[PDB]
Amino acid sequence: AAVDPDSGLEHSAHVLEKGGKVFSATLGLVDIVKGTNSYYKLQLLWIFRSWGRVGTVIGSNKLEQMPSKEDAIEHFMKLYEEKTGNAWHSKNFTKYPKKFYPLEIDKSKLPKPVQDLIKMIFDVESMKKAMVEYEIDLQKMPLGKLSKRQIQAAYSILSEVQQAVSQGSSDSQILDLSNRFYTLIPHDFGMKKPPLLNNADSVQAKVEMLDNLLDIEVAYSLLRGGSDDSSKDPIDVNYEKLKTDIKVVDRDSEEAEIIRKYVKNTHATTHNAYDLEVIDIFKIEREGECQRYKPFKQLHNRRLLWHGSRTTNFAGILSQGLRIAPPEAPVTGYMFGKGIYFADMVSKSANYCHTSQGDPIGLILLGEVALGNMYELKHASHISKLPKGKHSVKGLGKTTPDPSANISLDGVDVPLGTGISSGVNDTSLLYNEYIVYDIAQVNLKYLLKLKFNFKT
Template sequence: MKTYTAAAVPLLRHNASVDDVDAKTGATIYYRCLFKQNMLFREHRKLLERQHPNVNLIDPITGQTPLEYAIRNNPELVTGLLNLNADPNIKSCINEENLLSDKPVNALVHAVMLNSVEALKILFEHPNGVTTMDLTETDDEHRSILHVIVSPYKSATYDNVEAFKMLQQYLSPEALESLINQKDIYGKSPADYVASQKSSKLYDVLSPYLTQTSETQRQSSSHDTEDMDVDPVHELLPVDVHGDADLQKRKLELEDLKKKEEEAKLLNGGVLPDDWDKKVEIEPQSQLAQVGKVLIDANDEPYDILLNKTDVRRGYHGINMFYKMQLIHNTIQDIYFVWTRWGQIGEEGMHQRTPFQSKEEAENEFKKIFKSKTGNNWENRSIEEFVEKDDRFVVTRNVHNRQVPLKPIDFKKCSPSKLPLSLQATLKLFCDVTSMKQVMLDKDTDIPLGYLDRSVIEEGYQTLCNIREAVNELTAAQNSLDYDYRVVKDMRERLATMSNHYFRKIPYRNEKLRGIQSITTKEILQEETRRLENLRYLNGGANIILAAQYRAEIRSPLDYCYSALGCNWAEVGKGSEEFLRINNYLHQSGRTENYELMNVWSLDKVGQRERFKPFSQNSNRMLLWHGSRFSNYLGILSQGLRVAPVEAPCTGYMFGKGVYFADMFDKSVGYSINDSNATRGYSCLLLCEVALGDMFEATEAKYMESAPDGFLSTKGLGRYGPDFRKALHDNDGLIIPQGPVIERAAKLDSKKRKIEFSLNHNEYIVYNVDQIRLKYIVLVKDHNYCSLCNKEGSEIKHLSELKFGNDHLAGFNSFEQCVANSFLRYNGISMNNLFHERVKDLVIETNAYERSWSPSMPLSYDSKVCSGCGTKLLSMVVSEYLRLNAQKLPTELTSRPDCWYGDKCRTQHNNLAHSVHYNHLCQQTVGGSNPGTS
């Protein structure tokens, strides 16, 4: 498409003035070229050489002057504009939402607040720059330019010494000292602001000017008191998660037992059989479930066993098999069957049913098969006596007979929560059992949530630790100049044995195409480590949900979960500077415009302040991203971010065991994508204060148990990252990257050759969790997804942006649509106006939309929806409006009986007589005097 700049060129060649005004926008041709088309520097320079446009107007569209635009986007343009006598005193401000500051200010203040050192140098050096300005001028808060330099924002600074030195060189010592001690309307001077900040550069430069009062103020400022006045949204009450979870498991098992007792009575003519509690569920594939029962052995235990066999060495995909055995008595025909079923774990497999006339023959055959598969006698199958043997099956420890799957929480049947609605909605995302179960399947694990014993996870970590050492030895042997085939073969055999042991302990569901494989590389080790970490967090989260369900009758499950997390939450106001800083961090470090910041909460986890105290004065503390799925957050927030258990300190990550962070939203949000239909479109991330100290900079993968000597952390250098010259420092010295994203210059090796980046984005790794302070939890939404149906679409708009004609009623039959159109037209109301005037009180505030959708977050007028859901909302508004104004409708309409199926009736759309006779602007009911047909 032809750009505006290109279209303007012929006009300019024919001596059209660049100051001619575009009648449509009110902007000059020059302003349209500059602001609308992002004119290239060379094009702009040529234009300025040919003509001399007026550069002292405020653009009616963007609200900027050319100087403000240049400072924000391309400081190189500043010189050319000043040559054209651009006035740096003109105050302007770009028309954008979510700015850290939206007050019109002059060019010098813009340069300081954007920390544009290039623009500042030009303004101080150019004859048409600061020489034309009054540097002692103050704003409506009595803040001078020095106030802006030391504290451009209420609680953050760039710690920019260069800007101060430029001002210092320009002003006389007397004038500078006057500015340093000049107080604003809050009674604070620049010296006072510097004294309250932990950043040291400006303090060191201004220290000769500081008074004794300011020195005392600085000494009394401490990280330990920061955020102590945060008002949490709810009190943390004591909870016993493990105890309550165990009680809930027992409760579920007893309920399941009770259900089986009732079934046993029903099948036995109302009389409970003596051996009902010994009854084992018969596999349905045997076709004996209705006529048989599993026999009991001499030790009063059922002839029912599940075996498994794992061997990564067998075949291309390895072996990961189960073998199920039952001894079943057909009570109708008095025949005994040895039932066996076998196959790959995760599949139904094959089966066989062998009949016997006598119980003794069947028992002997059952025991014979058991011994042939395991190498053990049936009588020695207990954990204490069973001996695992090579190339044989083992008894599965985690038999599922007594394990009842975790069920979703029915919040509508529970005690109401006392938490803010926005926090309730977020915790519901964390408590989505369906998502957690899906993740368990994704991780190839077939164990009910909450039933994976912690000791099994610990043993799994220890096994992976041993495997890592063996993998390192194998890698070294394979790369050795003295390659020995027999040594490598022995190492692979040892790794196969350890892998078999690991997969027996950590249940694994097969993938048909991949199967199961020996852990022989760092990549496979990394994959298994992450799987185990997810299982740890999932299991911890599931136990919190189980515990909350146990106490649901006396306490809201959401309130219980809140206390179980051990974190004080405080919502960060959407208009606050704190919120806007985070929003700017998100958008500057996220090279996509898809995400919208929904909510931010500050966190204060119990005990972390004391643990972090040794690092609280570290000068290199940075606010960094850490992303994870919703299903992990109950585990993460309750346990904290963890490296690995003490008993198994190893992982397979790129830079060794540690907790990984990023300075790019783009990188971390990739770990937060949720596949569940209920949560799709939403993501949650942590922003953590991380004490990095001296960082070991790595350009390629290197496994480390800890940072090298003399370093506190590792930084994996990426090609792209935020421009740290623009980073803010809060009053406590925490560095907050603000972008924009720039490409890094390649490092050179000892021979001056470029070292290629192995990462696109920076990674920060700490090996001691005490260096981490959970600071914020951030909820974002991909606005390409509808807020109601959670489906992705191209026509997603804010409710406030939706426009409707009079034929947009979804779900209305032709007769009732005609009634609605006629009634609204008669009253002079358009459907579009009705929607925007009444959607809040008729649908949003009454939660009427929940009849058709179960959105992840409460609907608001700012929510984005697809066109289909928007049309359905319009229908709801019109339906509710007609119901409220029923007295104004003819009695022939209001006296019609309701259709049993209400607005769900299908007949109404193809049977005019039915749609005329029955009212369908109602909900489906269970009965009625004349329900109609559907």
């Protein structure tokens, strides 16, 4: 990391490191019962100490010049151990009672709609606002990159909470994990106590947070880099970083009429809170997504299906394709375990865009997903391994698009019929879900841009 500007000597003297270990640590301590939720940043520029309640004006600091440089190590490692409990070097860290815990820090030639697409998916201040509702610390999280091993442990804590919640474990068991999580990921609750992770959807909410937070740091990783040479334009630099060939499907096109039909037709009768309106259609072609999908063009039963996600995620979805949840993450929220989920209805997928009356525009995908021999399920069931000969899973719903009106498209079955009753009604799903447990089975075809019209 760099120098903290609270010292006032940020662009004057560099932060020091002895060979490998960088003399700079950002500590944290939270007790849900007491309500305390504090930070403690220590640095060696001069030694600098910062402290207070995370996400508020509560706190203070002390910049202090040293007599010498060897006295700095003495003052630093002493203050460290006094506050954290451990020594500066260690094989594995161990938390101590009421001591702190250290957090692991690390002229454009394109169409106007394509420029707006980059404008939409690379505006990171819009992604910052998106995290404000989650109550993630807004102050120093953009400049302070939280580690990968750290976030995996944060995922693991959430998965431990769901396990604890499922079999009605002790309050202390839950209290610990709630403490552990908020220490590991600094939240901003202001002057009130951190809430306990006791619900089944509270972990899901914090699981969703980590998924979104990850993609913002990924969006930064793309934006920060490349070769800054005076030749290409700023928007073109960010386009090449996406590693995809995007094209604008014209409104006069015959294939464009199929998508607008697929949007208009497959709107849910129950999801009447908003009304869709297709602003644009983009044909999308990822780098080497056809090379990996060649295997599954042999596979039968291929369907063109919807898949929605936050506008913040589309920065990463283009660069890495659709990814399955990590093995550390909790299975809560998922109906049939971790995998890529798809729907035959635009509305059901469109809810995952997360739009409001203030933020109307949103993005939704259409991917040729090779389902193949399907494993059909009625009720929710967290699966680990698929049955023999099955390449996908299907969640059977009440309403299904008319199978006698299934139009084809480049050798792909597009179910753009309106809703009718299904074959079986002993299910706990209202609409269909299509699940693949391999990132190779998906092949993204179209990206849409949709305006939402509410009534308020």
